[PDB]
Structures are given as C-alpha cells and as structure tokens.
Symmetry: C5
Subunit: 311 residues, 5 copies
Amino acid sequence: VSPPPPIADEPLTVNTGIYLIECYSLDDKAETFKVNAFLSLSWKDRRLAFDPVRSGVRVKTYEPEAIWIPEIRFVNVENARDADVVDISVSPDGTVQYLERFSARVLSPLDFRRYPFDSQTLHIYLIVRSVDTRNIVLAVDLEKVGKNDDVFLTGWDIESFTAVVKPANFALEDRLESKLDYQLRISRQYFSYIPNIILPMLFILFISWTAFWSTSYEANVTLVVSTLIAHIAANILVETNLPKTPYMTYTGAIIFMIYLFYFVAVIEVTVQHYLKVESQPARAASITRASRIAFPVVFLLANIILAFLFF
Amino acid sequence: VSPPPPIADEPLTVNTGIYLIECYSLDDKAETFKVNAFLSLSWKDRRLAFDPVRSGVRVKTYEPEAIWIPEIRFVNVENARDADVVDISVSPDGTVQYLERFSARVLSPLDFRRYPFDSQTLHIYLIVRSVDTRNIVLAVDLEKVGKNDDVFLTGWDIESFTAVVKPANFALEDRLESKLDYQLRISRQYFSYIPNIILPMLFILFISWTAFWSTSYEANVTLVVSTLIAHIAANILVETNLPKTPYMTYTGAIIFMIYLFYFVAVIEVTVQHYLKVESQPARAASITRASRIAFPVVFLLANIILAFLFF
Amino acid sequence: VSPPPPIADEPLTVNTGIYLIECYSLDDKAETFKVNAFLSLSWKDRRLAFDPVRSGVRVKTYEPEAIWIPEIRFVNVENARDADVVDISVSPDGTVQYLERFSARVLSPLDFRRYPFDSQTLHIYLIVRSVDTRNIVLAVDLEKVGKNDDVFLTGWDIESFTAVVKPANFALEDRLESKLDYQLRISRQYFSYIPNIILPMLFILFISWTAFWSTSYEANVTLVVSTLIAHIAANILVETNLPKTPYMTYTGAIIFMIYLFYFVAVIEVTVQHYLKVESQPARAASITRASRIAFPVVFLLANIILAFLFF
Amino acid sequence: VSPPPPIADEPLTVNTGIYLIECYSLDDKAETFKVNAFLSLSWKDRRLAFDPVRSGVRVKTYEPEAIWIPEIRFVNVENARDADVVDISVSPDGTVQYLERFSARVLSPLDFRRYPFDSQTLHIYLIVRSVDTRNIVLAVDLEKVGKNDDVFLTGWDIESFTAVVKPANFALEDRLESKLDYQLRISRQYFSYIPNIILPMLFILFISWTAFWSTSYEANVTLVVSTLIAHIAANILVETNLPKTPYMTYTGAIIFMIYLFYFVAVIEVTVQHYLKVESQPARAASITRASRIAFPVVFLLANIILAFLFF
Amino acid sequence: VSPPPPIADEPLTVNTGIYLIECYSLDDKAETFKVNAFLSLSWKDRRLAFDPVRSGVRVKTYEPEAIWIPEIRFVNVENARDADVVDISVSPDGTVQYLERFSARVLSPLDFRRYPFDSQTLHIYLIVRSVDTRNIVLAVDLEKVGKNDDVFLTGWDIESFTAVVKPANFALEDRLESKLDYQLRISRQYFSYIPNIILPMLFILFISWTAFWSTSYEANVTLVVSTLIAHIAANILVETNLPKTPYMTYTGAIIFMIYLFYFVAVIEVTVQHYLKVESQPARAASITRASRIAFPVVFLLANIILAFLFF
Ligand SMILES: [Cl-]
Ligand SMILES: [Cl-]
Ligand SMILES: [Cl-]
Ligand SMILES: [Cl-]
Ligand SMILES: [Cl-]
Ligand SMILES: [Cl-]
Ligand SMILES: [Cl-]
Ligand code: NA
Ligand code: NA
Ligand code: NA
Ligand code: NA
Ligand code: NA
Ligand code: NA
C-alpha cells in the first residue's frame, strides 16, 4: 500500500466529481453551510490489473483498506468530512472507480454588501498533497459533477454547481499540493424581508412624521420617541441575523440613515415647541410646513442615492 | 461477499419496511425532524439456501460481516443514520430477513402557507445504488410498515405513515438507483395559538380602536402607538418560530394587515386632532363616528377575504 | 454465540435492574431527561456451568465477546445508550451476572395541566426481542432497582423509582417482544414561581386597578396600557419555558384570564372618559365606584373557580 | 488480565491523583463545569516484578492492553470521560504508575443563596467497584494532586484544589465501592455586577422616587410605571442567568423587595392625586413629604436586614 | 516501539511547526477559537537509518504504528485534537518527517479592557512529556510555521502567526515537560460598532438633552425616561456579547457613565419643575440654561478623560 508507479515521469491524475444530494444550514453569522454529497474518484493503478478469464469476474470490488487510495481532503471544512465508501470498482487495466457519500460543514465567506438582495458563490475546495514517490494532481470529470433536482437551501435559490476544471498546483511545506474549486452559486430570496422588516420599518417612520401636523409637543415627543424605540428593536433584530462586517451593508446603511431622520424630527419638534413658547408660532408654522415636504422628499432622494451606490 | 447471482437477468428485489418507534424534534425553522425506527430488509440469496430436513434448523442466524447485505441509504438525512443490527434470519430457500434499529435527523421541506392551521407530509426516502454484477431494486413489504401507538410528535397529530409502493428507478452517475418514498402525514395542533397569540393580538387591536371614542389627542397617540409596539413584539415572536418563505403565510398576511389598521388609525387620530385645532370639530366628529363602524367592518371583511384566499 | 438452549420449552428469563446514579437535564419543552445509571442483567446459561472443586474458583469472569449476552434496548431513547460493561460474573450453575453503566437521553411525555404545581411519572422502557431458537422474557430483580441518595433533578423533587414487575409481552415484526416499565415519580418545586412570576404578575394587575381611583383619562390610559405590556412580557416569558399543548394549563388559564381583566379595564376607562366629556360624571362615578369592588371580587371568584377546575 | 492476587487477605490500594490542566464552562443554570486534567493511578502488581541488576532496565513500559488496570470511574459525570493514556511504568518491585489525560463534563450542585457574592465547592468523585477476586480501595497521593498556574475559570477565582484523603467505602448492588472526593474551591468575581446590574437597578428606583417632589399625577404615573417596566427587564435578565431554586437567593430577595417599593410608590402617587381632586392637598402634602424620608430610610433598613439574614 | 536511545545523555529534540489552514469561531464570551492546521514534527531516530545505494530508495514511508512517534499534546484545548496523519518520511540518516492535519477548540484568555478597539494574542501551547528512557525537548522549525493567505477570522484582522523559539522546560509530576508557545496576533474590526452601537447610543443621549429647551415637565419626563430605557436595551445588548470581567472595559465605562448623565438629567428635570411650581421660574431658567452648556461640555471632557485612561 504505496502509490501507483509512473510508466514514464508523469504525475498521477486523480479525476474527481461532487454530486450534491443535500444542502442545508446556510448560517449567515458563521458563514458556513452543511453539505451531503457523493464524492467520486478515479485513478489508474496497474498493480491491480487482472484477467477476467482467470478471475472469472469482469470488474473487481475492493475494501478501502485492501488497496491504495489517494488522501483527498477538503480545505475549507470545520472538521474532516464524515464519509462512507459506497463502492470501489477496479476494471482489468487497473482503473479504479471510487465512490463515497460524505457530509461536511463548509467555511465559505459571504459578501453582505447588498443584503437582503445579495447573491453568493459558495466554495468547496478539494485538495491532494504529493508524496515523495510521486506527484499527485487533481482533475474534474464533468460527467460526475452535479446536484439532485430536489436540492433546496431554505431562503435561497440555487443557480449552479460547477467546478473550475484547472487545479491550483502550488508548493506547501516543501511538497506539491493540487487544489480544485467547486462553486455553488446561490441568490437570496428577499421576498419575506418586504412584509416583515421593510414595510413595518417604513410605517413606523411615516407615523413619526404625523408630528408635522401636530402642535401638541407632548404628543409629538410621544410619537417620535416611541417610533424611534420600535426602530431600535428592528435594528437589533436585523443585526442578530448578520455578522459584524468591516464595510456597510445596504440594510445597515438604510437602518443608520433612518436614525438621522428620527434625530432631525426630534430637533424639529423641539424647535417648534421652543418658538411657540417664545410667542413666535408663525415661524414655527413655516418650519413645520416645510418639514411636511422636506422629510419625505429628502427620504426618497437619500434612498435613490443609497440604492444607486449599492446596486 | 459479493451480490447474489441472477438466475436469468432479473434485478435483485430488496423488500423494505420502516416501523416508527419514536418521532421527536420537528423543527419548523430548520425543516427537520428526528426519527427512531426499525428498518427491515428482505432479499433472496440462493448461495445461502440449505436443506430443512437435513439441517434440522428451520432458520439460520448470521452476523452482518458473514453475509452480503445491500447498501441501503437515506436520501434526505443530515448525516448517515446511527444503526444497530438487531437480527439476520435465513430461511431454507435462502430468503434473508434483516432487521436494524436506527436513528436519523431527516430534512423534509414544510409548507407554511396555512400556518398555524397547516398539515404536512414528511418524507423518508430510502435508496439503493446498483452494483456492476447486477441491478438492485426496492420494494415495500406493507406488513412491515407501521408505527408504535405511543409515537407522539409534540404539537402535532400523526395521521398516517405509508409508503409509495412503486420505487423511482433512475440513472445517476452511470448506475441505476432505486428510490422509495415513505410518507408521514401530520396536522398541526392549532389550539394553543388561540389563547396565546390570536386572542391577545385581537385584544390589543380592539384597545387601539377605543381612540375612536376619545377626543384627547395625547391619550389617542398613547393608545395607538403603545398597542402598535405590542403588535411589533408579537410579529417578532411569531417570525422567530418560522423560517423565511418566498411566499405569504396565513399568519404573516394577518400580522401584515394589522399594521395597515394601525397606520390608518394613526391617520384618523391625526386628522381628528388637526380639524379640532382648525375649529372644525363637527367634521372630525363625522370621520370619528364613521371610523367606529368602518374599522371593525373592514377588519372582518378583510379577514373573510384572507381566509377565503388561504383555505 | 447463540442463545442458551431450553431444558424443556420455557422462555429465557432475563432478570433486570436499574440503579440511578445521576438525573439531569429535564427539558420541559423537549419532554426529555438525561440519565446515568447501572443496568444489571441476569440469566442462566447452562453451557457456561462449571465444577467449583476441579476449577478452584467459586466464580468465573468473562469478556462480553466471549459469551452470549441478551440484546437489551430502551424503547423511549433519542439514540442508543452509551454503555460500558463493568462486570460479567458466572456462578457454578451457569447463572450470569451482567453489570453495565450507561447514559441515555429519554423521551417521556409530560402533563402540564397543573403547571407549575405539577407531578410527573417519567418512564424508562426496557425491551428484548425473541429469537427463532427461543422466547426471551424480562423480569425485575427488586433488590437491584434503586437510586443513589445524592440523585438530584434541578427544580424537581424525586419521590420514587420503581418498576412494574409484569412485562408487556407482544408481537412486533413477527417476533415477540418483552417490555418492562421503570417509573421515576417526580414533583415540581413550585417555590421560585411565587416571587418571580405569580406575585410580580399580581402587582402589575393591582397597579392597573388604581385607574378606578383616577378621573385622569391620560393617566388611566398610561396605567392600563403600560401594565398590559408588562403582562405580555410575562406571557412571552412563561410560554418560552413550555411546549405548545392541545389543552389549557393552569398558568395558561390564569395568564389568559388576566387579559380579559385588562380588556374590561380599558372599556371601563373609555366609558368613564366618554361620560365625563358628555357631562354625565355622576354616572361615570357610579360605574368607577362599582369597578373598585367588582374587579377584585370577580378576580378572586374566577381564581377560586379555576383552582377548583384544575385541582 | 485478572486483578493482582492478595499476599494475605488485604484490599488492593489504588493510589490516585488529579492534576488540573484546564477549567472551563462553569454553567450556573446547568450546574456543570468542564475539566481537562491528568489522572494518575498507582498500585502493586507482584506478577510484573523484575530484577533490576539482571534486566539492566530500571523501569518497563507497558501498553494498557498488556496489563491489568483498575476500572476507575467518575460518579458525577454526564458521560464517561474522554481519556488518552500518556504512560504506564512498572518499577522492579511491580509498582505500576499509570497516567492518563482526560476531559469530562462534571455535575456539581451550586448554592446560589448569596449570589453574586457566593463561593462554591465543586466536586469530582472518583470511584472503583470491587471485583469478585478482591476488594479495591482508593487512596490519595497528595504529591500527584494539583493544578496548572494558568488554570482560569472565567468569572471566578480559583482558591484551592484538594482531596479528602479518606475514601467513602460502601456496599452497592452486593459489592464494595470506594469513593474519593476531589474538591475545587472557587469564589465568584462579583465586580461586574456593580456597574452592570446593581447601580443601574438603584438609579431607576431613585428615579421613581422623584415622584415625591411632583404634584403632576400624569408625570408621576409615567415615572413609576416606566421605571417598574425597566425593573421587570432587569428581573428577567437576572433570572435567565440562574436556575430555579427551592430557596431565596440574595439577589432574588432584593429584586422581589424592589417590587414592593414600586407597588407602595403607586399607592402613594394614587393617594396624593385622590386627595388633590378631593380638595385636601394639605394632607396629600404631609403624606408626600413623609414619603421623601420614609422610602429611602425603609429601603436602607430593609437592605441592612436582608444583608444580615444572608451574610 | 520505544524512544530513540541517546548517543551520550542528550535530550531528544522534536522540531515542530504549525501551518494554519482555517481560523473560525472566535467566541468572546467563551474565550475560545477553533483552528484547522497542519502540525509538522521532526526528530532523529538512528535505528531507522539506511543506505540509499543498498535500499534503492532516498526516502522511506512508514505507517504511524510501525515506528516510534513522540506523544505531542496541546495544553489549552477543550478536548484532544482531531488528527489525521498525512505523511511519515524517513531520510537515510534516520531524520523522521511527520505531518498531520488537525482541528481543535482552543482556550485562550482575552483582554477586553479596550473593547471594541482591542487587539489580542491568541496562544496554541504545544507540549511533550519525557519518558523514563529519555528527556524530550521541543524546538521550532521556522520554515514550517505559517498560514494560508485565505485564513480569515470573521470580525478580526490577522496580524501575525509566530512561535516563541525557546521552549518553557519544567517539571510536572517528577518528569520533564517541554512547552512551546505559538502566537496568533489579531486586531478587532471596530468599524460596525460605530453605526450600530456608538452613534445610535449618542443620538438617544442627545435626544434626552432636548429637555433643556423645554419647560413641559410631562414631555421632559417622557424624553429622559424613554431614552434611558433605550440605553438599558443597548447596555443589555452589549453585555450579552461579552463575558463578565473583574475589570472595567472601555465600552463598559462609557455605558456606565451615560447612566449618570441620565440620572443627573432626571434631577435637573425634577428641580426645574419643583421651582416652577414654587413660583421661582427665573431660577429654574438659570439652571436649565447652564445645563444646555454643562451637559455636552462635561460629556466631552469625561470622554476625553476615559479615552486617555484606556488608550
Ligand atoms: Cl475533508
Ligand atoms: Cl443513511
Ligand atoms: Cl438502548
Ligand atoms: Cl468516568
Ligand atoms: Cl491535543
Ligand atoms: Cl521545574
Ligand atoms: Cl525527567
Ligand atoms: Na488504503
Ligand atoms: Na456484509
Ligand atoms: Na404618555
Ligand atoms: Na455476545
Ligand atoms: Na487492561
Ligand atoms: Na508509534
């Protein structure tokens, strides 16, 4: 149980394939996803050549311990994959066809800049390290790359599952490593964000603007402070479903901006009361009437600017 | 330890059965459930046949390693099932009777459209991959499909546990695959939703409508904004027990609609105050009196429309 | 190894005992508890009999693999128990004495009808399946059923740990099965519920009733709506520590009833204000004075009725 | 691989030691803690004795399978410990020195009566069950009991790690059992409780007492009800970090008492308003002025009484 | 399989290296982080030396069981590492090159004094215990210490991964132990704390100060008490993402200080109302006008003092 010997001086090519059976638990905060799939492997080992006439059988079936199997690992996994060998078939020339079903929790960074209208490219990196006897290189058998039609990732649309056919061959700790990039392209189902977060957040904001049709300071204070507290609750709710990013997200920008609108509404409500107490309500009336137009107009234009900067 | 050889050119039929011992942890957000059950398998292995009058023994008990056993897997599981072989019995003609007790976490999508008045069909998909020597096909032994009377899934009523007797035979990565669909039909116990969520949510809404019998703007603002905040708390509580769906749920629709009622109540309370300040209370009185009838009437008709669209 | 042969045609009796070492994690929502205990087993295997004189030993120790051991399982467990064999002792007549220490997560339904003044009977169901060679039946050795004095279940009082001595013998998948019921009787420590939930909930309710000694509508609206919101917080807190039941719990009934008291207090506060504005305060005064007696009296009588229906 | 035979009729003494490497995850609610430590064992096995002059070797190293090792278990663990044998060394007289590194989740009850100014004694109970051949007894080698200087338990001060040198020898299921008590003494770091919970809780209470310098009923109702709601939030926050106890904790007592102060403040605010409406403000003034002194004085004396009863 | 014998009396030097593949799950509350890395080991075993000419190979590949391998452990791990041996290679002079890929959960204390503008030094302590045959000492092969360019720790910047080349040699239970300190220097990405916590917290505080431009006690009480409650929500949110420390954190200090500002604002609002009721508004006006300057000035200076003490 050592690697197959080279006929000339070539590296050993291990053909690979990943067929997705299940996709689940895309954790946005952890930037992980769980996968259940078939991993297929194929390589020539002439030491396993046989005559179907003598052995009786046209294809030989082996146990993983009985023969040499390339040590294939995943780069971006939390722990080593849970695998169960399904089959090891050896054909007369010594071509090995290896099939395993595995499950793994994959680390794959996510770009939240356009959240909740974002798309992602999840990666599964396959790797093999070369041995001293000989260099091992990975290849993609496109016939053995795919996904079950029923594969569903709750809250996401699965677009494609493809592999970058050219491996990344590089040196690591004085030995060659051959890395393959399997890419799962997904797009977020933003639907539910509209009736659950976006519209309720707009309703409470518009409710605070009713203070521009009221001269009652005590009612105005209650309108703007109460809706601000509801906005804080939405800010907290949203930030619990997201990791801390060194950049602004689209939702983060809108949520932050809405604070400025609450802050300026408090200034307006204060200025209005102050002028009324100072017996200059004609002035207060001019500021309040302007605010009725300015607040929705500046809100609309600021949102057009933000949508433009982000999309 | 190779598959039993075919007498002619027929596929090997593996008769299956699942007997549920325990059902627990139906997680709505994760769309998973845990199961503890018996898995029974039966097939003919002529290489294992024996004489009943010569041997004296009617049945022979083997260890799993001693004989060939079909590699049966579950499609929609998180990780491979935890299984412990209970018994292996061989009849004189070579009919093998295999029994294992297993536990598994099953991925099965849920339809939340009618939540909390929803019914579901949970699936357990049994699968076998054919070997080079011969094709393996699955069958259902209805005599060995069932569930323990004590099987309880907290918050659900278990209706039936049946199997679709015709397997889905298809090619996958150049080998035949035979898939069986075991269906667990359940209906949600909606009882607790009435005193815990539905009635409290209706009470706070009706409390906001007392503002239509009050001329006090400051009290009205307090009534409508305070009850709105309580409604936000219920919206958040409900959405934490549910996943994000690319469709509207019945509860989601009602919760969303109730925001419109709070928004229009704020408009009414604002309009009423504005007219009183403008010394036109006769008008304000006509709008407030109309609102006393309009709000409960439109609420009832909108709910009839929603119940009709969803049921 | 095969089961011990019958001298005549009797079933093989496996004597059992469970000695509790640790009880922990009684999860009310999951309706599970974790257990760490000794499982003792005893049966006669004539094939292992020996003469004490020519052996020089009064007892013989064996490794589990060396002899036949009955396949004993738990019915109501999440996963198969984690077990470590402690000792296997054989007496001259071939009486085997087996002892293992195990840990398991047990599914046992709970009756929340009288919560938090409830008592429960937790079950541990022991089971054995019969073989073709012979019928295996379970028995209880009462001398080997017990619990360590230090066994504590946080938030509960342990009353007794007994076994129903007569097994439930029945056919399951065309083999007889012998089931024993081990019962752990516990009663909930309701102490903490009094200063943490019951009294705070009564205080906020009594605070809302101070509105019956106030003519200030604005203050009344603030008193009743603010305490209602605090009651919603307690309702949410309580329902998070409990599963959803298809029946009313004692606490659920009280919590639900207190909403009616808040709803009727809002009606009273509204009616009082309406009459004052309509220049009929003498009337409003009669309703408010009646409410001062009616609300505590109806609250006391409704609680006596509820306590009667539930206890 | 049977136990060492007795020279006379003495029990086999197994000398033990536990050296703590890591302490983590002290879970107050679960009353558990995780430990990573060295477990050292020593006993005489004359069958393993050798001559040091003729062997030329001072010590012999054995693999665990090669020799007899006592079955040592922990009483108060969730599951059996995860252990890795480090070394087995035999001296010429046959004295065996066993060393393993283990990790375990330990169940150890906590006394919350003085929380957050509490100290605890965590226990690790070592146990051995006597075999039929001979009685096994445990002993403490104080030279092999200790802890790493870097051992830190977040939020706690580690005082000492000692063992009660005299084992508890007792009969359990017709065999002797030898139990040792390893004690880890810890004291809670109460620092953070002062700026995060104690002072904020006192500030909101003192804010409610500003109502004794106000004649505005509407403002008073807002002051006392709003701060009460903040107190409910702190009550909930505190009770989430603690298990339910069948006794009063120091914090629980203070939190409960503060409700009485809010309840009596509401009565005072109600009585004051009622008298003002009844045109007897001179009286109301006497009650309000008395309350300014009574509330802080009774609060101070009640806290002195509570601190005395608990410390 | 015993350790390599010493030529003279020298300790065996085991050269080590850690190459980080993945860094994830830095848990601030638990003070843990998960790591996936290569562990490389190298030592001279003369008994394994060979002639390249005679053998016909320049390298010899062994299985871990075939040769002696040093028992290397991590000090600060929850459980023993999950390791898979990748390669073992022997050079003609007996120089062994061992490579394993492992995953571990590491305990490493964090200094929260400057949070969220903090930097940390995570430690991975490698350790080896000497055997009776010989003393084993650890060394760092700097050529085999590193990290993959794609190594990302969500919410942190990775600065460096270095090893302290001189081991900490010490006696533990009368055997030499050799400890190496691998240091991962990280700095927190404080960006998101600015729009999510810092600015919202400043906005609500500045909103409370609008009470210094209002004579309305009832509106003032609403402004200061409502924003205080929002501050309590932020205090709770922040303290949930942090462990309890026996020292003040920078954020903790600011959060605590902001309570004093709310408390003094309530005193000012009370004093102002009291004087107005006592018919001395000229005085109240002088205190309120001073407060408009004093509150922002003292807030700015207190923050400069705090930033100075902490940075
Ligand atoms: Cl892997
Ligand atoms: Cl499976
Ligand atoms: Cl079991
Ligand atoms: Cl143990
Ligand atoms: Cl380790
Ligand atoms: Cl030393
Ligand atoms: Cl040494
Ligand atoms: Na192999
Ligand atoms: Na087999
Ligand atoms: Na108010
Ligand atoms: Na056996
Ligand atoms: Na042993
Ligand atoms: Na070795």
